[PDB]
Design an enzyme around this catalytic site. Structure first.
Site, PDB file in Angstrom:
ATOM      1  N   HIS B  41      98.323 -22.129 -25.860  1.00  0.00           N
ATOM      2  CA  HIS B  41      97.683 -21.785 -24.604  1.00  0.00           C
ATOM      3  C   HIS B  41      98.486 -20.678 -23.731  1.00  0.00           C
ATOM      4  CE1 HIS B  41     100.044 -24.375 -21.915  1.00  0.00           C
ATOM      5  NE2 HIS B  41      99.345 -25.377 -22.735  1.00  0.00           N
ATOM      6  N   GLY B 143     105.130 -25.379 -15.543  1.00  0.00           N
ATOM      7  CA  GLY B 143     106.289 -24.725 -16.332  1.00  0.00           C
ATOM      8  C   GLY B 143     106.900 -25.469 -17.239  1.00  0.00           C
ATOM      9  N   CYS B 145     105.397 -27.098 -19.895  1.00  0.00           N
ATOM     10  CA  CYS B 145     104.693 -26.846 -21.456  1.00  0.00           C
ATOM     11  C   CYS B 145     105.722 -26.380 -22.439  1.00  0.00           C
ATOM     12  CB  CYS B 145     103.365 -26.043 -21.314  1.00  0.00           C
ATOM     13  SG  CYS B 145     102.291 -26.608 -20.141  1.00  0.00           S
TER      14      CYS B 145
HETATM   15  C1  LIG Z   1     102.529 -25.579 -18.520  1.00  0.00           C
HETATM   16  O1  LIG Z   1     103.976 -25.301 -18.283  1.00  0.00           O
HETATM   17  C2  LIG Z   1     101.898 -24.322 -18.749  1.00  0.00           C
HETATM   18  O2  LIG Z   1     101.805 -23.508 -19.726  1.00  0.00           O
HETATM   19  N1  LIG Z   1     100.731 -24.307 -17.786  1.00  0.00           N
HETATM   20  C3  LIG Z   1     100.883 -25.407 -16.798  1.00  0.00           C
HETATM   21  C4  LIG Z   1     100.166 -25.777 -15.755  1.00  0.00           C
HETATM   22 CL1  LIG Z   1      98.964 -24.703 -15.140  1.00  0.00          CL
HETATM   23  C5  LIG Z   1     100.704 -26.918 -15.091  1.00  0.00           C
HETATM   24  C6  LIG Z   1     101.557 -27.703 -15.617  1.00  0.00           C
HETATM   25  C7  LIG Z   1     102.233 -27.435 -16.713  1.00  0.00           C
HETATM   26 CL2  LIG Z   1     103.469 -28.728 -16.972  1.00  0.00          CL
HETATM   27  C8  LIG Z   1     101.955 -26.334 -17.490  1.00  0.00           C
END
Ligand SMILES: *[C@@]1(O)C(=O)Nc2c(Cl)ccc(Cl)c21
Ligand SMILES: *[C@@]1(O)C(=O)Nc2c(Cl)ccc(Cl)c21
Ligand SMILES: *[C@@]1(O)C(=O)Nc2c(Cl)ccc(Cl)c21
Ligand SMILES: [Mg+2]
Lengths: 305, 301
Positions: B41, B143, B145
């Site tokens: 994603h 951030g 993910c």
């Molecule tokens: C994750 O880092 C990511 O790619 N996008 C996202 C959003 Cl929108 C919210 C929380 C997290 Cl941990 C992530």
């Protein structure tokens, strides 16, 4: 979101851990620049509990009596000297993996990560607090002597603790990296005991703020209290006194949540008097006191190393 | 002695964490040999959150649309492919810090360490477990993910989890490192709800055995139970069914303590009935279910 007991990444410290052996005693050492730091009791024997002077026992050891292994590599000891309860073994090679670091001493109630090691090999990492009685609640592991505790600032490792002994209540005791003990302990082979402990009030408050930030609000109420009134409650429940400095340090969390500290104290007062009534807070049925205000802010704002 | 959940030392994984940017999205990647793994994603725009067509998004991308930063070094992407829900970016440099590793898919009840990372830089390490409903109760901010879960039994890193999303109940969902989601979840922002969660019975029993080895016997009783009667009672407390596999797995701890597995089941049944009455077991006022039978031997309880 979510809130976990979280340690610092341990890589910078893993590169410093070595095995130290003297006679039949093997434990862990910390290799930084060209010096290996370990508990001075590594040289101690059944025979020599009959000596008031460690320096007498140490001066009789040759450099070659210390076998220091860094993974597969033997490290050649070229000097030995005592620094309070820490032994400093000068070696002929600087550690190429020495991080930026400093030796700092911490206060009861402050937290740090421990890299638990066995015979020079990192085994596990966990986060803990220096208890008010100056002990650490540690692992099932034994053989962890010489494992160290640390915080990481930016890229700088602040080493604050070295593990020296286990106490019979299942807690451990140790020194700063300059060999000064935390607490009323000695490293001689004598039976000792932890004093009665208390709960770290400012950390419980921090964790209640963490809960609120994560949506756990059931314990909040409309009331506020005074420092004096609350400290009478703390004393009754074997909690540390709350000071104005504690209040000030919680300032950022009071501003972020809209809950003033003495408002949260009124919440804590009611939890101490009435219990949790079968409810939980951040998944715990006990009030958690090993997160500092700084920890809560760092974990709910994403600082990295 | 004391009882602590410990995480694995994180250094071997720290050396693999990188930052992956596509467009205005930055998340974490895992760099092993010459491949960087991250959630697919990362290629989604604001319009692609509900019904992303990943194949359509990916065919429009060039190698040079993916910025990969390892420390302060930009890596050169020389190919890309998608495997289930993971993107695999081939880069021009093998990671010199690649540990011995493997990819393992775990089952509910298994534990692992998570190295939470932001912008490719590690933040903290904690221990968790795959819940029976295939979620994990982590600590993840925007951030994070692409942060990974792992075990390190014997010098070899077994990567078992990569973080993809947070569900509305505040729990977390992700994939193995072959990009297959744990549980029924998909990388879409449509409504999906975690199954009601349950307690991991075999882990509670393991931890009760550890308590005994550590010297605490106050919760034992004189009874035993059949396996079926145990399950009939424990289901009423939203405990997972205990299987014969679980009974076999508890064999070593049973032999060590001399407490038969179904005798310890009887003790758990009474704890669920009575509560703890102000007492703790291994320092906890709740029954702990994120310590496996294997975790007790890795500490050598
Ligand atoms: C994750 O880092 C990511 O790619 N996008 C996202 C959003 Cl929108 C919210 C929380 C997290 Cl941990 C992530
Ligand atoms: C160590 O226990 C020992 O055998 N002798 C000794 C002395 Cl003289 C001082 C301190 C310590 Cl820890 C020891
Ligand atoms: C520690 O490993 C050490 O050097 N000696 C020792 C003893 Cl005697 C008991 C327990 C531990 Cl963890 C250690
Ligand atoms: Mg109030």
């Amino acid at each position: 979101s979510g809130f976990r007991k979280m340690a610092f990444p341990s890589g910078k410290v893993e590169g410093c851990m070595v095995q130290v052996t003297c006679g039949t005693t093997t434990l862990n050492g910390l290799w930084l620049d060209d010096v290996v730091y370990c508990p001075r009791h590594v040289i101690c024997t059944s025979e020599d509990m009959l000596n008031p002077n460690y320096e007498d026992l140490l001066i009789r050891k040759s450099n070659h009596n210390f076998l220091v292994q860094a993974g597969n590599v033997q490290l050649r000891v070229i000097g030995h000297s005592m620094q309070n309860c820490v032994l400093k073994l000068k070696v002929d090679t600087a550690n190429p993996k020495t991080p930026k670091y400093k030796f700092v001493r911490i206060q009861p109630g402050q937290t740090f990560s421990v890299l638990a090691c066995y015979n020079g090999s990192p085994s596990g990492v966990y986060q803990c607090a220096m208890r008010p009685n100056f002990t650490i609640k540690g692992s099932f592991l034994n053989g962890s002597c010489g494992s160290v505790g640390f915080n990481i600032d930016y890229d700088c490792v602040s080493f604050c603790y070295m593990h020296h002994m286990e106490l019979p209540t299942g807690v451990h005791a140790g020194t700063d990296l300059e060999g000064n003990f935390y607490g009323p302990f000695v490293d001689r082979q004598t039976a000792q005991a932890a004093g009665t402990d208390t709960t770290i009030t400012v950390n419980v408050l921090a964790w209640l703020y963490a809960a609120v930030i994560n949506g756990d609000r059931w314990f909040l109420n409309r009331f506020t209290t005074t420092l004096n009134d609350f400290n009478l409650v703390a004393m009754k429940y074997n909690y540390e006194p709350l000071t104005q400095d504690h209040v000030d340090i919680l300032g950022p969390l009071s501003a972020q949540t809209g809950i003033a500290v003495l408002d949260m104290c009124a919440s804590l007062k009611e939890l101490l008097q009435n219990g949790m009534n079968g409810r939980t807070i951040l998944g715990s049925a006990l009030l958690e006191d090993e997160f500092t205000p700084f920890d809560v802010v760092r974990q709910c704002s994403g600082v990295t190393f």
